[PDB]
Structures are given as structure tokens and as C-alpha cells.
DNA sequence: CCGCCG
RNA sequence: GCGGCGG
């Protein structure tokens, strides 16, 4: 498991948030079972089921967070984990910004679109350097891009 | 009253014949209405030809099956405990190998039950229903392996149950497995047995699978052909003869085990499509030519090698897909047992072909009605499937007439395996209501079927969809098979249409149970109506769209427990099926053809059709329902009236004006009272009882029999050995009790007399009888008395003496007496009512109109529902109904709002606005303005954010009424209730829960003879059980004596309970319990056997319990 | 205090956050239609999308009541230890969004409606699976007849 | 035979019943044997049950009970008090007097309500789960059939008002009565034995108002 | 029920059983099952190999098999962690006896051996709460204790004095023997025993009073063996004493108060007048 | 609740004890006649239709009300088992 | 688990 | 004995 200081921080905070959510969901659960007024309603199965979806995410965050390596390599040349890549399409001159990270760090919401390590486009980029040109398959066809550069 | 309906989704085709499932099933079941000439030869006829050509040479063949003269009529069958059956014989002719064919033109072998016009049957006096059933449609499927996540296994399911249950597994470490009855054998072995040789086989089969190496496995047994057939026998587990006893093989040929289901569609369907392609015969059936043909065995493996390999198609079979589950219509169920009887009969007829003398055998010698009657009889009266028709109210009956169960023969499904089946599956869409299942154990296992859901040729619940080629939608519909629905892309019916064309680019549709936004060009099929998604029963809730599915169920189920109220009112706001339910169910009586009314008696309506005919329709006056509810038909037509074809002549038990009504529409305020509406309590206004708003009539059927003892026949006469005349009044008729008499608990309903203390006269009671009056009737008083609880008014009586007209009097039974007792059920504190949305509750306090919540204008409310029960449970629908219901009151109009297409929030405020001009408009003119009270609540309303500050009270109140809230003064203080409160006309009902069933209060009484327990059964009641759960309860408390008291003084210590009783009589302090008869009885029970159980003192010594 | 369909107020931002999430779904789609995200990652990110979107809308409604209608029937009920559960209220004013499939894997699309507004045909049907699986538990788990109270009583009953 | 039947062959009554005659062993063991008798328990005298209804006014101290039921429940006790007051000359008279409800002397009620003065009864919920599954209350005679129950204890006995029904019993011995109202009365069992937390916690309605 | 100290004569046994049972209804390993597994000494689905030796850790990675070695200067307890297990103790630091070397649930028996009893107890108690806690339920540890304690009220025998080896008898009944073997009558014939962990169900099963046994187990055998040795059933416990119909040994039946008398100063001086 | 039950509970070393005392004293109240009390002068229990609770309402009610005052004595082994029932019948008609 | 109807 | 049903 490999994480960036950024990645770590994020997953650590999310974990925090889900703990608050679990404590809430719990409180809730407890109230229901204590009510014993309206049983057989989507009062338990929902509260419970909800708490579960949480605990699960928690086990995933604790697992990943319990044994992840941190690679401090902001100065490197070839695309590796933590590397921020930029790809221009020869044709449209489109500039695409991405960052390859471990499966647990992926997130299209981030500044550089964080792509999974074992992600197709993710695979394609690891092991290459500024200048290279490569393809992968896409529903519309297949678009090759040229690594314009690689910031930290 | 005007009836406005707000539906905007053009309902394309009328709902189908709701009872069609049952009705048609039996029709096609016993094709008995048309000549032997008509084609339809399934069911009866089919099961006939299946086993009729009997070849023992003996040759008995089938001609025609005829039947039709019903022993007696409907009601007679009920009045006399008679099973309404038709008589069935059939022409048969037995041939001989010598010259001669005697045809005994008639052998009545059985009596099969009939089907009412409503759809119910009458077995023994009572009306029952044959509920439909589901199972794995006898075919062939492929499911993933148990634990081994690796590869999947092949199944081959055929019913009836006796037929094998085949599976095909492949475990690469050494075998290819085919299981029948739990034993595995080389799949090849059988293959060879058929002719498939290593070479041909592997080459056309092993085109692409190395696995085949697993088949060409026999370089030893695979070189001997017909010898492998013998080799496969060895395979059978028990020591039998090598040769001919190929019976076990004969069994998997063409007759008994594989299925005799209609050649072409029954099994073959699961053939052609799912795997291989052709079916020679009916099943892997062929014992012809000495060599066998199994165009089935190889392809099953042919698909195994395909599945495990490439993508011939993605063959993985989802078990629950209704495309693999069939529904067993009554017809099928009944026809089922029938051929079981046919078989049992043919069983003995072959025996009597050898016992045979000569040509002198035909009717008698060949046919014995014994098997077939016990057979059929057994089904209708013993099968766990036909039951007591739930007729709390018509609707009730109708549901119970159409639900599906999983439990049954046991071969289909059992109890402890269900988490998977209980789920409403993807496929249930428009085929199984997702809401009709019952709460608690058995959930999702037993459910009612959908609106348009109709059972096809072989059971897969088909649903209706609309064709749509291009961007065009048709008026042409097709009932798709669950499986066939997946091939297309269907779209919802909420989709906007300008007439015959789609309306938006991005329109909703569901591919394969998957929500997808599709384009107008891709829509191949569209939903008929939202209705189809749920059940009839469900389709009755007004604003279901706003109600949590979980509570919706309670709501649907609740309606089934509604009870017939004298004054029946249809819902101020209805769904649009009320009319139909009553219709298709047979509560109300409609006019066949056009015409005029002749007589409008309160017992019969006679009309004259314009076609030169005049009929008399008798009205079932006041019949006793299966659940004990009033069932009368009240004519709603006047003398000499021109009736339209299909017009209500009279209203049914709960249908008025042709609409279904169960309970009444009451004005309701939705707020909290002291606490009378605490948890789920409901408050009621005396004012309701006053106008007999909630009153159900009830009937209990007490019965007694004049048995024939060898001590002396029990006589039923006005004579009662105990000499009282004041209690003999009501019992005027010598033996029976007078109609119209008021019977209370403890009164004699019927008198009877039997012989003394068994065998011998008492030598102690012969001296007492002789002292005061030796000539005392030696007969004893055994009379049917009014069982503690209640009775009421005797209304009908039935006696069956000697010369039986046409009744089946059990043996020993001299004569029978039935007494029907009725009473009026006015709503009282313990009664429980509920609305269609799921708000259920009991009456907490019956409030005097005097001080209950009234509106500005004198009008008080009728019931107060606690608001708190609305948030937790999620059923806004009710609060909605209430709003609309509010317009309906002042606008005096009922509305019809479709399921998902119903009324909408804007439109209601629109009618509400109109309602303000009626409520407040008359107020302005009548000559008065606003109260200082109304102003005061408006202040708290504006500070509440309900009204827009700065407008006139007039304007304000309007905006406030629009929200659905009005003002309300207490009634007790006449002071307003700070803050607008919502109120309206809500449809609520009383349930089959009278408190009549709720108060056994015991003081003293009967004890068991063998075991010392206060069991009841007579004028005395039983005492509640204490169970250990409850003892612990006491124990924890440290409630020593309270517990001691339960165990002894109140139960077993005969002598103890005595002292206590006496003591209490003396106003003394109950005696100290020394030894439970249980203690002493144990000592002895232990003495009686070896063990010397000795009680000891402080210092290990004796002590006496005795 | 009483309930009225209007008392279940829908927060103005619902139409916003949903829009924000909606477009947001497009990005994720456009991203896989390019080949970046694996078949699985697509899934999980979307759930994440709503799991948060839904949670957002939850505090929104609440915020709306706390600032504008401090005395809302529905609201007040839930705040006071009276009745109501945040999760439920959300199904009223905001929306119940994620209902799972038969097996367990939660649904890809969310239940965009609130109970206030008319829950759609399908959304309902889909929401069904849950409620049934829920009653399922209660049936087996209830009828266990407090067996432990029995087993527990058996050893500690002396 | 009389010791243990079936251990070796099985004795039958002459042709008529191929049923093994219940032997001593058979009389002790089994699901419904004898060692299993005194335990599983049985039915109580002076019992009753009915539908429950919330009693707002009622204090946790008391409980709403239907006179009609009280009558029957406290029949013996009543009888005696009947003689104590000329409503009847003897016990058997009191009884014949009560055998027919049309003639409920208004004075009898005075008596019944007089015999109940400070006695209490017990109440039971459907599944008795914890010690509080049964509490004791002072009965106050009321109209109707349903039984008035105090709201605050609704939480104790998992019990709502959608038609649930509770049973009621009577402590006959002045010793039973005692323990009943001392260590078993409601108002005395406020905290839960499960956790030190209260079980008389004010519920939905109350709170709301407050 | 109150808040002051527990009154002598209270059916705690009961009380504990109840408080722990009611809740059971809403616990659907995850859930009730686990509670059973826990009350019943069992080998859970996801077993986690405990360290019988208390030393330090060292791991060998990459091969169809991963092995965790608790090692010291003299010996290392070889632990085979399948290629599909998840371990969280790592190459380097110390590990007490009975410490989660694998991830998941633990097996009582093993944990009893390695660490000892005071740990099994504390483990159960807590591992129990763990569920109710996550289920909203708030029950005092007391009760989980009362129960669990009975789960080890029995012990086996390795060194005999009056009775033979291979015995499974009451822990306390042995503190009476060894107490009176060294104390009152001399001759120190030590009665070495091995604490025995039994599930809740089998603790009941093998209870000591015959009356009690007669109810559930076979009624034939129970009476048979109690016959032979004239067994004297000292009536203590509610079950047995119920059958007698006698007053429960607990509650008001408490021997502590079942005997108490009341006097009016007038009768006290009147008893003194009888002197 | 009940009149100073807390005061009562304070007067016993264990809850259940109070019950036993309470009870047996209610018994002696009826057995040996209902005039065997200690606080009848002023503030003796009372009823509502006719001030007659002075004669015979509830026993236990009395016991408690008596126990509330320092009149009665209760002990493990206070008076010789049998000698008590003998002296009681003697001094009470 | 407890309860009731046919 | 089996179906149904209340909490
Ligand atoms: Mg209920």
C-alpha cells in the first residue's frame, strides 16, 4: 500500500468523519430499540443497515491506513506512484492533468484527477517519461497522448 | 355531490377479470361445458387419455367423459353440510383378444366439487379456496457451485415428485458427475448405453473443450456397447438380476418419471430455448427398438461445455426469474390429484384383468370408485392448500382467492430455507405485488399477485406492456413472459406523450431490471399503467406514492380485515378500483340486460327486460359469513325504473352505490389530546355512536347434537331434570329456543338429556332421590347453554330430524340442531380502527361532543389522531387524503386519484381555495367577521411562519386554510388552540377486532381430570398460562409468595386451593401451603420405582410430606 | 402541533446539490468512456458521490429548519426527544436515496425523490427490496423467542 | 412394564389400541412428562386479560381496571364484604344475588370498591422478557371493557396501543399482596436492572409538550 | 431496581439472564451468532492464532506460506499463517501469551491455555459487550460476568486425594477439600486441578444437584446414578426448590430474612414476664 | 408512591426483609383480632365514604404505618418461637 | 416468546 | 393435529 502525505491526510480525515457518523448512527440505533413503540417498520433494518454501510467503509479505511507506505519522491523522472502527469492530444492540443496513486487514493474530485495504480490509463502511464507516446482502448476508438511533463 | 377524478396517464385497457385466475382455470380444467368434440383436451380429458388406454391381451379404452347433474343446489349444500359436487362417469369399453367388445356405457367413479360463479367452492357446508402455488418450473437450469467458487453444476427438474431429480457436476480430479437420488456415476456410462460412441461423441461435443478428455475417459468400458446398459445396472446399489430387470432404466424412458406434461410446451419450452433444441416425444423418453434416444442427455452436457468455455450465450440461470417459476392454477392442482386417482384406479383394474374368468368382465370387474373419491375428497378437504375462505368482508375473500404460496407439497419449497426466495425479485415487476406479503414469519413467501398479472399457458405470470415502434406508442398490448421482457427496453408510463408520440429526449426506461435513461428511438415497449406494478389490494391506497412501502403493506393487509358496517361509505377520496372490486367479486347484484323494474321487495327484486323476459332475483337477506359478518343485499332501485345494462340492482355487504365501502368517512382533527391518543391511541366523539356510525352486525353459530349412547338415546326436549320453569320460557318450542328471544350468558339455547354417571345407578343418589321424590327422571341435563361471553338475539334455527330429505347425517348422530345468534356491535373503547395508509389504533376515550375540538362554526370533529404517529412511520398519504378530504367536506364532493398518477399538490390547493368560499363565504354574508380568537391564533401563526405578515385576516386565514389547517377552539375552554391545526375527511375503518374476543375474567371453575389444571370449556374460563419466562420475571422480583401462590394455591394443591377459597370467604388470611401435590406425587412416583426418595430434616433425619 | 403535507418543507438547495452531483456524475461517466477508471472504481466513486451528496442534503434540510422554521411540527417533533429520526426526516423533506438490490450490492441509481414529492413508480419498486429484506430479519430474529433468555436462564438460574 | 415400557418390546391393551400403556418411566420424562410439569407451569386462578388503552389521568401508582372484571376477579373477597353490610344475609345469598347482572345493586359496587381499597393486582405484557414484564398497580374501577394503563410504563412492557392485550392477576395472601406492592409495584421499579438508566423516561408526547 | 446497594436475597442469577436476553431480539459472526459462539466455548469462523509463548515477533514473507515466529533465546513457536490470512503484529516487537497474531476472532480454549483464566473471563465479558454496544444496548458488565463466571465453575483433576483422576467437578467443592486437607486434618495431599472452560450450555448440562438434572437431561440416567450413591440434594437454587413447591431460596425466600419476627414493646415486656 | 417507603427501606438491612416484616405484622393484625395496633389514638388510617377505615380496610397498610414509627421491634431471634402466640391470644380479646 | 379463531 | 390471525 502506497500513499502520499496528501493521500494519507485525506484518508485519515475521512476516517475521522466516519467515526462521527458511526457514533451518530449508533445513538440512533439505540433510540429505536429503546422505543419499542413502532416495531416492524423500516426503523431498525434501515438504522442497522445504515450503520453497517459505515462500519464497512471504516474497516476499509483502517485496513489501508494500518499498513501503507509513504513514498517521498517529488524529484524523479519516470512516471511512478505520486507522479503528476500532463498529457496533450497531438490533434486537439488538449491538456489533461492527472496523478497516478494507489487504488485507495483514486478520486476524480481532486485537483489533478487521481487515477488508480492498477487503473488502465494508470497502467499506461507508469514506467514512461516526458516525451513518450502511448495508447489504450476507448469506446470511441483510441487516443494517443504525449507526456508533456511530470511535476513532483 | 360531484365526482372529479384527476388522472392524466391515459389508462389504455380496462383491468382484467380479477377472478380470472380461478374461474378459467377450472373451466379449462374440466372441459365439461362443451362436447367431447371440442379440442381443449388438457386437465380431466388429458389426464384421462394419459392413463386410459390400459394394455394389461386386455384393452380398455376411453370414449367420452360426461357429468353435469348437481346432486343438490348451493345453499342446500350449506344448510345441510353437503359438499357441492357434480357427478362424473365416462363411457369406456373393454376389448378382448377373442371376439367381443362389451361396452359398459357408464361407471360413475367419483364426485368432483364445483366452482361458484364468484370462484369459491363449498366442500362441507363451508366455502373454501384453492390458493395458487409456485415452484421451479420442471425444466433444466444451470446454477453456480455450492462452496467451490470455481465451476457451476447442471440441474434437471421433473415433477411429479416421484420422478428423479437429476444433477450434472464435474470434479476434474477424477470424475464427471451425474446424480440421481444421491449416487454419482460416469456421465459417459449412460451415454454409451445410448449409442454415443467415444469418437462421434467427443468430436461433435469436444469441438472446443479439453474437458472432453474427461469423457473419452473409457478405454475399458467404452468399448462394450449394449453391455454398458447391463454395466449401468450393476451401478444400481442393490443386488438384482443382470438381465431384464431394466425396470429402473425403463422408468427413465417414456412413462412415469420424466414428465407427461403436454408435448411441445410443458418441458420442451425449457428445452428449445434454454439448451439443445428438439424434443422427440415428451421427455428423454424412448424404450423403442431396444435402443434408446436421449436427444436430451448430450446437450445438457453440450451446454455444460459451452457455459464453462466461451460465450455461446451467457448461460447462467437466475433461479427466481419468473421465467423459471410457474403458478399452479386450481385446475392444475385438482387435475393433479385427479390423475393420481386415475393411476390408483388403473392400479387395481390391471389386477382384475388376471383374476379374470372370461369375457364376462366390463363395468364392475374393471372399475372401482374407491380410489378416485378418497383421492379427490382428500384434496379439497385434507390438502394444506384449500382452506377456510377469509370473508371478513368481500375484498378479503377476493384476495385470499388470489394469493400465491411457496409452502405446499414440500417438493417445491420448505420452511427453513428462504432468505433468498422471500425477496421481491427483479422479475416480480407487474407479476407479484411487492407489498402484499404478510408481516412476521412467512414473509415474502406468501404473496398476492399483480393487477394485470395473468397466468399463461404454463404458469409464468405474464404482464401487459405496450408496443412502440420508433417514437410511436400503440394501443396494441402484449402479455410478455418474464424472460421475454428482458430482451427489450421498456419505458415507464409517466413519460409525457402528445398523443401517439413520445415527448422528451431523455426518457426513463428499464433495460433488465436496471434503471436506464434511454432515447425515443430505442423504446420498444412501454408500461401499460402504474397499477400493474402492485396488487388489487394495494391499488386501493389513495396517495401510495407518498407512503413508505413498509407501512403501505400494513395498509393493504388492513383492508382485508375491514368489517361490514351497516352504513357503508365509499372513501371521500378513492383510487378508482372500488367500483370494480365490488363488481368482479359478486357482492352487489347487477342488471343483466336493459329494461324496467317490476317488484322491489326487501327480499327480491323482479325486473322486466325489454326483450320479453321477466326474472326474480332473491336477495340473500342476512346470511352468516364464514367469519361471522352480516351479508345482506339492500335494493337500491325503485319500482318501475328504466335500468341500464350492468347497473346495481342491490348493494352488496360493503358496497354502496356500487362502490366498495368498509368503514366511514369521519371529520378528523390531527393533534394531541391529554394522552388519550398517547402511543397509538385514538379518541372518538360520542357523536359517532349517536348516529350509529360504526356498528357491525355479528353472528355466532352454536351447535349441539343428540348423540346415541348405549345407555339411552339423548332426547332433545323442553324437559330439564332440574325443575325450573322461569328459564324454560324462552325455550317455547319443545326443545328449541324461540326466534327473536334475548339469550344471555347462562341461558339454555337448546335442551338435551343423556344417561347418568356412566354404567350403574349411584347407590348414594338412589337414597336422595327416594327421600324427596323417588319418581325423579333418571335422565340428566346436558343442554347447549349460552357459553360465557355473550349471545344476543336468536335469528335463524335449523333442525334435522329422522326422515332426512338429502342430508348426510354422521353415524350415531340421531338428529342435529343449529342455532344462529346475532347482536349489534356499537363502537366502544376497546375496538380498533385504521386507515388505508397504515395508521392503526384502538379507541382510548369516547368523548362527549360537549367538550371536544370544534370549529369556528358549531361543527365539532369526530376523531383526533395523534400527530406523533406520522413522523416515525412514513406515510404522508394520510395527511394528504386529509387535505383533499377537507375540500370535499365544504365542497361536498368525492374524488378519484390514481395510484402514481393521482391528484397533485397544486390542484388540491386549487379545490381548497374553492372550499374557502364555501366555509368562509357564507360566514361573511350570514353577517359576521373574525373572532378575537381567530386573530389571536393568526398572530401565533405569522410568528410561526405559516402566514405572510402584512395581509388582511381574511386573506390570511385563506392562505392558512390552503395549507390544510384551519382554526379550532378547544370546546372545554372555548379558548382557541394556539396554532392552526389540520383537519379533514379521512376514510377510516373498524377491524375484525371487537373486544368481544378480549376479556376472559376468571374467578373459579373446572379442573382437568388427569392433570390438575383450571382448563375451561364450559360456563367457566381458562386461567392464563404462567410460563417459565414469566416465573423468572417473578423470581427476579424476589416475589416469593406471589410465585408460591402461582405454583400451588392457584393450581395444583387441590386441598390448598380449597383452604384459600374458604379463607377468602371468611374474610380471613389464606392458609400456608405445606406440600404441593406435585412434591408428594413425585416422592411416590419415585417410590413406585426403585429409588427411595426420602425427605430430610436439619440433622439428616425423616420428615413427613404425607 | 400537527402535521400537514406542507410542514415537510423541501430545502431550496436540494435542486442545487442534486444538480452539482448530477453534472459530477457526468464527469465520472466521461472519465470511464475514456478508459481511465476500471469497471469497479467507476462504481465505488459514484456511490461515494451520492453517499456524500445525500449526507449533504441531510444537514441542509436541518439547517433550513433551524434558521427559518424553528417551530416546524415535523422538525420540533424530531428535535424534542418526542418522535422522529433524522434519517427519516430526510426521507420526508430531502430524500431517501440509496436503496440496495436483492443480494446486497447497493443500487447504482439513487432515489432522487422525497416523500413530500411523489416517490416514483420505479424508485418505489426498487425501494421495495429493502423493506422486504428488513421484515425478513424481524421474522426470524423475533421468533427466536428470546432463546438466550432461556439459555441464559438455564445456567444462571441457580 | 410398570417400570419402563418399551425398553424391550411394547405392551398393548387387547386388540383396540396398539398404544404402549403409559409406564412409570413414561410418567416422569418427556416434553410433557412430570419432572417437566412443576416447571413449565400452568394456568392461574383469579386471572383475566383484556385489551389495553392508555390512561392519561392515571398515576404510575395506579392502573385502569374494568369493574365488571374486578367483580369476577374479586368475587370471593366481595362476597364476604357483602355480609359485613346487609346487602346479603349469607354467602350463598350474595352469590345468587350476583348470578344475574340485571340486578347489580348500586350498593355492591360500593362494596367492591370497598374491598379493593388498598389491594393491588399485577399486569403482564405479551412476551414476558425482563422482571418489569409484570408490574403491580392499585386498581381504580372504570367504565368499559379495555384496561387503562399508565403511559410511562408502556416502555417497560414492550407495549403500544394498537390492540395489544395484557393479563392481570391477584395476590391472595396478605404476604403476596405485600411483596406485590412493596418490591413489585410500578412506582417502586423506576430504574432498569439492565443498566442503571431510568425506565420511567418520559416518552414522545410528554417530551414534545415539555 | 433501586440505586442503593443490592439487598441480600436477590435473584441476581435471573436478573442477569434477563437483561442479557431481552436485547437478543435485535441482534440479527456479526450479531447474535457471535453472542452464542461467545457464550458457547467455540471455534469461530475467522479464527486468529494466539501466541502460546510470550516473547517477540519475526516474520518470513513471500511464498505460498507466511510464518509468524514468536521467538526468544531458546525456542520459537512456529505459526503457520495461510496465504489468505491477515496478520497485524510485525517483524520485531514483543507479544504476550494469548495475543492476536492473526486478525479476527479468538478461540477461548487456546486463549485459556496460553495467557490463563483471568484473561478468558475478561475477554468474554468484553467481546460480548462489543456487540450490544454496537447495537445501542447499554447493559452493565455485572451480568455478563455473573454468567461467564458459571462458565468456569468446574475444573478437572490431575492430582488425587479422595477421588480419582479424570474428574470434572465444581471449582469450589475443591477449595473445601484442599482447605480441609491441609488445614484441619494434616497430610498435604494436594489436589492439583486444571481450570475448565465450558460453554454455557454444557455448564448447565453437567450441573450438580440431581433434582435440577431430572428436568432436562435424561430422567432415567439422572435418577439412576443419584440412586446408587444416596445423593442428598441440598436445596439451593430456584429450579430444584420450585419442584418442591417450597419457597424460593432467593427473593423473600432468602435464608437471610425468611426468618424475622415482629414485636410490640407491650409483648416484649410480656415475654420478660414469662421469666 | 407509598408513604415514606424510603424511610421504611432505611429501617431494614435488606429490602426483602422489610417485606417479610411488613407481612407477618399484617397477619398478626387480623389473627389476634384487629385491635392489636399501637397508634390508634390520633392519625390512625382512614377511608372516604364513612370514616370507617378505623375498623377494617387493608392490613399491610397498617403494618407499614405502624412500622413507620419507632413502636415495633423486629429481629432475627427476638421472641421464643411458640411463647409469642400464647401470650398474644391472652392479652387480646 | 404470548394469544386467539376454524 | 393443520390453516389463519393479534402484539
Ligand atoms: Mg401493536
Swiss-Prot record, chain A:
Stored InterPro entries: GreA/GreB_C_sf, TF_GreA/GreB_CS, Tscrpt_elong_fac_GreA/B_C, Tscrpt_elong_fac_GreA/B_fam, Tscrpt_elong_fac_GreA/B_N, Tscrpt_elong_fac_GreA/B_N_sf
Residues binding Zn(2+): 16, 20
Coiled coil: 1-70
Keywords recorded for this protein, A-Z: Coiled coil, Metal-binding, Transcription, Transcription regulation, Zinc
Gene3D superfamilies: Transcription elongation factor, GreA/GreB, C-terminal domain, Transcription elongation factor, GreA/GreB, N-terminal domain
GO BP terms: DNA-templated transcription elongation; regulation of DNA-templated transcription elongation
Recorded GO MF terms: DNA binding; metal ion binding; RNA polymerase binding
Family designation: Belongs to the GreA/GreB family.
Function: Inhibits all catalytic activities of RNA polymerase (RNAP) by partially occluding its substrate-binding site and preventing NTP binding.
Domain notes: Inhibitory activity is regulated via a pH-induced conformational change of the structure. At pH above 7, Gfh1 is in an inactive flipped orientation that prevents binding to RNAP. At lower pH, Gfh1 switches to an active orientation, which enables binding to RNAP and inhibitory activity.
Quaternary structure (record): Interacts with RNAP.
Protein name: Transcription inhibitor protein Gfh1
Source species of the chain: Thermus thermophilus (strain ATCC 27634 / DSM 579 / HB8)
Lineage: Bacteria, Thermotogati, Deinococcota, Deinococci, Thermales
Gene encoding the protein: gfh1
Swiss-Prot record, chain B:
CDD domains: RNA_pol_B_RPB2
Transmembrane segments: none
Entries under InterPro entries matching the protein: DNA-dir_RNA_pol_bsu_ext_1_sf (IPR042107), DNA-dir_RNA_pol_bsu_external_1 (IPR019462), DNA-dir_RNA_pol_su2 (IPR015712), DNA-dir_RNAP_su2_dom (IPR007120), DNA-dir_RNAP_su2_hyb_sf (IPR037033), RNA_pol_bsu_bac (IPR010243), RNA_pol_bsu_CS (IPR007121), RNA_pol_bsu_protrusion (IPR007644)
First-level EC class: transferase
Pfam family, one: RNA_pol_Rpb2_1
GO BP of this protein: DNA-templated transcription
PROSITE patterns, A to Z: RNA_POL_BETA
UniProt keyword Nucleotidyltransferase, yes or no: yes
Stored Gene3D superfamilies: 2.40.50.100, 2.40.50.150, 3.90.1100.10, DNA-directed RNA polymerase, beta subunit, external 1 domain, DNA-directed RNA polymerase, subunit 2, domain 6, RNA polymerase alpha subunit dimerisation domain, RNA polymerase Rpb2, domain 2
Family: Belongs to the RNA polymerase beta chain family.
Entry function: DNA-dependent RNA polymerase catalyzes the transcription of DNA into RNA using the four ribonucleoside triphosphates as substrates.
PANTHER family: DNA-DIRECTED RNA POLYMERASE I SUBUNIT 2
Protein name: DNA-directed RNA polymerase subunit beta
Classification lineage: Bacteria, Thermotogati, Deinococcota, Deinococci, Thermales
Name of encoding gene: rpoB
Curated annotation (Swiss-Prot), chain E:
Subunit details: The RNAP catalytic core consists of 2 alpha, 1 beta, 1 beta' and 1 omega subunit. When a sigma factor is associated with the core the holoenzyme is formed, which can initiate transcription.
Similarity comment: family membership: Belongs to the RNA polymerase beta' chain family.
Function noted in UniProt: DNA-dependent RNA polymerase catalyzes the transcription of DNA into RNA using the four ribonucleoside triphosphates as substrates.
Protein name: DNA-directed RNA polymerase subunit beta'
Species for this entry: Thermus thermophilus (strain ATCC 27634 / DSM 579 / HB8)
Lineage summary: Bacteria, Thermotogati, Deinococcota, Deinococci, Thermales
Interval of the full protein contained in this chain: 1210 to 1499 of 1524
Curated annotation (Swiss-Prot), chain F:
Domain of life: Bacteria
Documented EC number(s): 2.7.7.6
Principal EC category: transferase
TM region(s), chain numbering: none
Family matches, as InterPro entries: DNA-dir_RNA_pol_omega, Pol_omega/Rpo6/RPB6, RPB6/omega-like_sf
Molecular function GO terms recorded: DNA binding; DNA-directed RNA polymerase activity
Pfam families given in the database record: RNA_pol_Rpb6 (PF01192)
Catalytic activity: RNA(n) + a ribonucleoside 5'-triphosphate = RNA(n+1) + diphosphate
GO cellular component, one term: DNA-directed RNA polymerase complex
Single Gene Ontology BP annotation: DNA-templated transcription
Record keywords: DNA-directed RNA polymerase, Nucleotidyltransferase, Transcription, Transferase
UniProt record similarity statement: Belongs to the RNA polymerase subunit omega family.
Subunit description: The RNAP catalytic core consists of 2 alpha, 1 beta, 1 beta' and 1 omega subunit. When a sigma factor is associated with the core the holoenzyme is formed, which can initiate transcription.
Described purpose of this protein according to its UniProt entry: Promotes RNA polymerase assembly. Latches the N- and C-terminal regions of the beta' subunit thereby facilitating its interaction with the beta and alpha subunits.
Protein name listed in UniProt: DNA-directed RNA polymerase subunit omega
Originating species: Thermus thermophilus (strain ATCC 27634 / DSM 579 / HB8)
